[PDB]
Amino acid sequence: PQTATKHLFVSGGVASSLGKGLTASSLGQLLTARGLHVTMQKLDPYLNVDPGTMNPFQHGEVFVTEDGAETDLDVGHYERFLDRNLPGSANVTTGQVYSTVIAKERRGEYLGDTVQVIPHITDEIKRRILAMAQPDADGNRPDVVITEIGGTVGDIESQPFLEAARQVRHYLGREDVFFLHVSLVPYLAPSGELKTKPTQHSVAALRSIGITPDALILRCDRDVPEALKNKIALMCDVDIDGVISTPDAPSIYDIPKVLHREELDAFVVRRLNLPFRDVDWTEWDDLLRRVHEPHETVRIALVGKYVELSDAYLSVAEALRAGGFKHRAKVEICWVASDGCETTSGAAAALGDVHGVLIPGGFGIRGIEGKIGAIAYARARGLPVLGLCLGLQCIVIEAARSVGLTNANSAEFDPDTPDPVIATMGGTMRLGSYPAVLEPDSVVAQAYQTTQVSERHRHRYEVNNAYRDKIAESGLRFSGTSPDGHLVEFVEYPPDRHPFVVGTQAHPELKSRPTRPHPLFVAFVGAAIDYKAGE
Amino acid sequence: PQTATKHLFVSGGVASSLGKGLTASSLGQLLTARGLHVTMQKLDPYLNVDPGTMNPFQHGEVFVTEDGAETDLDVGHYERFLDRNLPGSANVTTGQVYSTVIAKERRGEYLGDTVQVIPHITDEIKRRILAMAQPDADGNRPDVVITEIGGTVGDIESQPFLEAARQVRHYLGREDVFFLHVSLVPYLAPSGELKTKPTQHSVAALRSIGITPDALILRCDRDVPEALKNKIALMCDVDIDGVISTPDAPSIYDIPKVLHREELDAFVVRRLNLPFRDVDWTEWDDLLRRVHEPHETVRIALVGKYVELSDAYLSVAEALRAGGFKHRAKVEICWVASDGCETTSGAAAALGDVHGVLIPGGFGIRGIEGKIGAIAYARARGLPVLGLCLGLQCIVIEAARSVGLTNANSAEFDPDTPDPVIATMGGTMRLGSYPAVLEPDSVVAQAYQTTQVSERHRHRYEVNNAYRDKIAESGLRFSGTSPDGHLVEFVEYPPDRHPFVVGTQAHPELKSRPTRPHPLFVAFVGAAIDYKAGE
Amino acid sequence: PQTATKHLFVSGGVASSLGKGLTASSLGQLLTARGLHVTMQKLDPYLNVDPGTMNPFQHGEVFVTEDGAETDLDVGHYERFLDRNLPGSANVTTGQVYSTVIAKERRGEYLGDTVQVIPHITDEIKRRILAMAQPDADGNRPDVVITEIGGTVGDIESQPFLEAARQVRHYLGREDVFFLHVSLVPYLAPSGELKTKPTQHSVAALRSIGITPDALILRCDRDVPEALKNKIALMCDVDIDGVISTPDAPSIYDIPKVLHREELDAFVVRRLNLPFRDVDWTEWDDLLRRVHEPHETVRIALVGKYVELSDAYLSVAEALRAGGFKHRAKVEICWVASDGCETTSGAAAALGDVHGVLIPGGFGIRGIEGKIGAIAYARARGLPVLGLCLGLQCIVIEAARSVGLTNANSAEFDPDTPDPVIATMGGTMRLGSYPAVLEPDSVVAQAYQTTQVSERHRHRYEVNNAYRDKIAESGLRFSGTSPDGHLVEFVEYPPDRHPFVVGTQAHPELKSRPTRPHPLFVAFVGAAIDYKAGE
């Protein structure tokens, strides 16, 4: 029968950006390929109640769950490597834990006590941790919960989450709880040596708060010598079979192979006494084939904020790559700044060499004149376009500006526009999954191969239903709607007007996975391949 | 001209209950008697937004300011030793600072940053500290702000307030900022020696977070030897003129004399470069005369929760003592449990030896049948009664039960009573100061020697105006009201019915001070003296 | 007139091997080129009383001072960058401080107290620090003492030296004392970013023991962005003019140019209120010319332990390079393992491509059969040879084996040899400087251009005077001796036997400096150039 649910606490030392979330995700994939029901959670030491207030260009994209919670992008890495939907519960923050305890205090639920960091804040954290172990919506209890602790050991803001994890270790005992600590091994070029001292000091910090690590992930630019691993194991009081050399992999999809080569998963399974079974590599070997052996290559313009890669579009880039993997193409992303595309000559300079244009949306942007101006170019050049949320809105304002409505805009972007073709139906923010119905033999229905779909939403403006008939004279079809028809969900040109120009109000990159590409990106990358081949 | 405003941070080590608030108050009195405009503030490390949720029998009375804020009782010690009204600003807590920062975050006021303990929580604390330095409602800038830091150095919950105080020291520099650290010197009886090691470890803890103490208050049951003070000064890196031996004083009013004997005030004034002037002892010498040389002695029953002293009635006890000081009486307080007074024989056993009965109110009590039953006894015995808030309500329900209304109660205490003579006019909670007008030649007007008064309120039930005429047939007069007459504020029997039986809806113990006793307690202790003398 | 002597404490964070000793040396050179009398000292946190017990291949060479003390090699970096002789006082260790205090205790010099880490160990450290400030053998008080603190902040063994430095800062005050902290900024390649978190945690550790850094040396593989320096200055409470970006330089002689470009020396001089004068670059500009613009290039075999660079021969390699600089040659060092040179074919394979053979000595070696075998080859091939200490001993045993004495050896290396031509005159270990007199028109006298010299010694075996006449028949001349003639100090072949083959019992690499090459290395590199050119 099933064991008690095990808890694995991934902590971090020396610095952030060591790839700790991708390490935890890869371990989740390894434990899943042995046949265990893994689930994952992140604790964020910052006070924002959710990232919906933070700028995504500075702090990365907001991820959205099926239930509509807004979360850190590591929940996106977990969903991609697990191929599992995660609840909003999967992202705790300090901002939420304090607000919850203070609200319980104002209602008198602590019966006249003084409220304190210990026990009340740590009890709320420990409650939110052990909540993840509860039977799912189908009654399946998970085998392992992998809680990743944000921040760095010895940040002030981390000290309640580490204390709650220590208390979970005290309550359940070592048979049920494992601590994995991620650390940096730096290389010093002038003297040609790897240094273990930062890992020693970081494990000493972790021991001074009452945690003993069961294993060490040694992040390094080169493979750590065995003599150094022995020195660490002796200095850190860690089993040598738990000292895992983790050099920089070529792609993120190789990290499971690195960890399996070191046998970290076997060490965890044995030390947690989990049911041992072999890793089924079949699916991930097929992914790594498509990743490493592309037959062709295509260039896609991502019409973003700036001419450089941004974590604001991490999920979009991953979804484009997965679309490529479906075709066994490479996808190379041309990061194109919107503002250079406001003039038609600037647009031609930015886009003329690419094979498709992706218009992403989000929050924290201005300057959609250059987005429309890239659409206006792409249509004349005959390039395929995929528009996501704001992308659809720019497509529909282009079409408004293609018929008579030369001053048309969104009410969001020109509050004085005489033609607000995009308008609040601040209105309701639609969040999470909503259903939609699709026109039969639409280009969208040919992509999805179904008439009914659902997608994840995060927007509050809509297509103004007063202009549907006007802008249909552009040629554009409203090939998908809410089941009542009240809301436009998808727009397309007919294939004889342009081979593939599609918009959606949703964020389909959120439902994409590397081993299960989303239909619209498979369709769009198809269209880009066909343009390149015919061009 | 006036200097920059100085900041004095009183911190605490080894344990709570060392009398740190009374020490800070006594230093405030000493600096005031030199002629400086002192003001005081407390920081509370607990998460309750205010103490109005805590039980006062477990955690002490809720103090109330003129503006109606609810605060820790140390604000009461400050008001009593300064004889100054303090704003609600004078009690910060963690509960308030977090709720404020989280609310600013939800409104987007941090412009897309991650919100962190440093800088944002420490900036909110530092802002609330330096707020105290601002010019008052008359434009007077204070000379010194004495912020007392709650908790113990090395409590987790204190670490943001100490960090904010360190940053204030960094911003203003040593010329403007002083740190006073209070510590315990224990005595070990089996080996007959005072131990300095706890003070060494507490100053080491304070130094490990970047604070250097300017002076040490050594709390002890006996006067610390000079050799030990020299050892501490050498071990702690403190000026020997800052090592202050502070043995347990006979009364709290002696603590200024202890501190002045050690010359702590001169050391502070010199080290802060404040305008040096001599202490005017005249008023406090008169207080210490009345305190130490009572001509007579009277017993007052405080009809409370239990037969032992409670911090739930600390201000009531201080106001009774100040009433005594006005007469040069001693007051001895008989702590009488209400529940023994429910039966008339039990009431007679509890009260028969005393000379007056005080019925206090508050929150966190049940059992007012025994309160009425003590009033019913006191009236038959001819003892004077002072009723505060709930005390008035019990007086008026006694009178309802004296005429025909034998099942009368408050709606608070029997929700099914057929005669709710006390009722919500949960209704409005009245908080802070409100004005009232008094009947000419009422016993209240003879006490106050004015027809217009104000008092501090904290209640939400009222006398039901539907029963005024009925209960006036008890003999009771509604000798004071709101200026519109809508609310009963004071009730009394005529002097020929009982010599002094008075109730008020307010908490007059909050406006009392040791050098300025409140009129109603001077009147009540007068009546008790006259009963004793005539009895 | 002269100020009080300033104290500069260079500390280290995150890891060792950051080049902290070379940074302190380069700052010493900069302050010297302004005209200040700098002096330097190192504190070693290890318990060895001196490095003469440690293996040099594992822990680097033992340096030797004029007075014969044995010290860490950082004293060699100080001597090379200052061009100043340093006393044995310049290397404190924990091993010495404890042994000194325990010996004073056994003699009763603490008059019956308990002896403690504080005050007695920290008083001994503080005494040894302030000793460096005393007037020199000519009466000159130094302007600055630059004490470098070994180890890493937060090593247990460092905590007494940091406490002593804090007490020096307390005693002399900020006007006289400066703290420079060296830290690592790592680069993470997968995400392309520099991380400041290790520096934040290392400065927090330094602040938790009561030290505030005046400046930060940021060691990095690339130049740190100004935005990061501003973030560090804000997070660390350091003046932005003290945040010094210190990327990896091409050669160690460039480090003064890096530090002067950042204006660190001006910041120190100003913050210490030292007499400001401009840097005279003339000599160091001439050095950097010769370093960066070599006209030719020569290969020298260093016949050592292994085929890789070793810190066991750091001073030898520096002396060879300085010899090159005198000629404006490059010197490239062929690291040749002795054991491959035991066979004549192996010797020919190891050495045939080089232009000169250097035979170094020391302790911690065996296998001098291969050293003699490289000499035997070099003589037949006509390559010049310089033999240092053990090198001379191998030359003289080669010559013993060239005449009749085929089993001759040292008594150190074959205790049963029937011909101990090298013998203990364990005998006296000669340490430090001794004088020697040289044969007129010896090859040595032509190198030194004097008949009288002194050199630094560290050996206990000698040439057996019983074999002088026998081995002179090899052709070898005893071209220098002790002034009494009792000890052989130099040996050479006549120029017609070999153009340059010289041995010495001393370690002339210790007296070499980059701006003042030692005569024997200038002569030997000359001979190698002449062989290459004629060959």
Ligand SMILES: O=c1ccn([C@@H]2O[C@H](COP(=O)(O)OP(=O)(O)OP(=O)(O)O)[C@@H](O)[C@H]2O)c(=O)[nH]1
């Ligand atoms: O300058 C000095 C002087 C002395 N020591 C002494 O050397 C000991 C070892 O100090 P290390 O810096 O070499 O640490 P480590 O070898 O154990 O790990 P790595 O970072 O190199 O990988 C330390 O305990 C210290 O006492 C130094 O490290 N540096």
Ligand SMILES: O=c1ccn([C@@H]2O[C@H](COP(=O)(O)OP(=O)(O)OP(=O)(O)O)[C@@H](O)[C@H]2O)c(=O)[nH]1
């Ligand atoms: O049992 C022992 C053994 C040895 N020692 C050693 O004695 C030294 C002094 O330790 P103390 O306990 O006496 O501290 P103190 O005199 O400075 O201050 P007081 O609390 O007594 O007032 C300490 O540094 C410790 O090394 C003990 O204290 N106790």
Ligand SMILES: O=c1ccn([C@@H]2O[C@H](COP(=O)(O)OP(=O)(O)OP(=O)(O)O)[C@@H](O)[C@H]2O)c(=O)[nH]1
């Ligand atoms: O995974 C997480 C989650 C949350 N946070 C929160 O982000 C804040 C900043 O944490 P950083 O890691 O980014 O430190 P830093 O920017 O100040 O310096 P660098 O090393 O990057 O150069 C921290 O205070 C933490 O609360 C993380 O760092 N990582």
Ligand SMILES: O=C(Cc1ccc(F)cc1)Nc1nc(-c2ccccn2)cs1
């Ligand atoms: O390549 C990227 C940038 C990126 C980030 C997130 C993405 F979804 C797609 C790309 N990051 C990488 N991290 C590693 C790694 C991590 C841990 C252990 C070993 N190697 C290799 S590459």
Ligand SMILES: O=C(Cc1ccc(F)cc1)Nc1nc(-c2ccccn2)cs1
């Ligand atoms: O007597 C009481 C109990 C009490 C509390 C609060 C009150 F308002 C009335 C009484 N407390 C005392 N603290 C000291 C003391 C304090 C500091 C330094 C020296 N002595 C003497 S007595």
Ligand SMILES: O=C(Cc1ccc(F)cc1)Nc1nc(-c2ccccn2)cs1
């Ligand atoms: O090149 C070597 C190896 C070596 C060691 C000692 C020697 F004597 C000769 C060579 N070390 C170097 N350290 C730096 C450096 C140091 C500090 C700051 C900036 N750059 C450049 S190169």
Ligand SMILES: NC(=O)CC[C@H](N)C(=O)O
């Ligand atoms: N989620 C998004 O892309 C938002 C797009 C646009 N700002 C809107 O609110 O409609």
Ligand SMILES: NC(=O)CC[C@H](N)C(=O)O
């Ligand atoms: N402040 C009090 O004494 C409250 C008394 C009573 N519980 C009321 O609310 O009316």
Ligand SMILES: NC(=O)CC[C@H](N)C(=O)O
């Ligand atoms: N200093 C050295 O080179 C020592 C060489 C040899 N071991 C000797 O003692 O004579």
Ligand SMILES: [Mg+2]
């Ligand atoms: Mg090492």
Ligand SMILES: [Mg+2]
């Ligand atoms: Mg003692």
Ligand SMILES: [Mg+2]
């Ligand atoms: Mg960062």
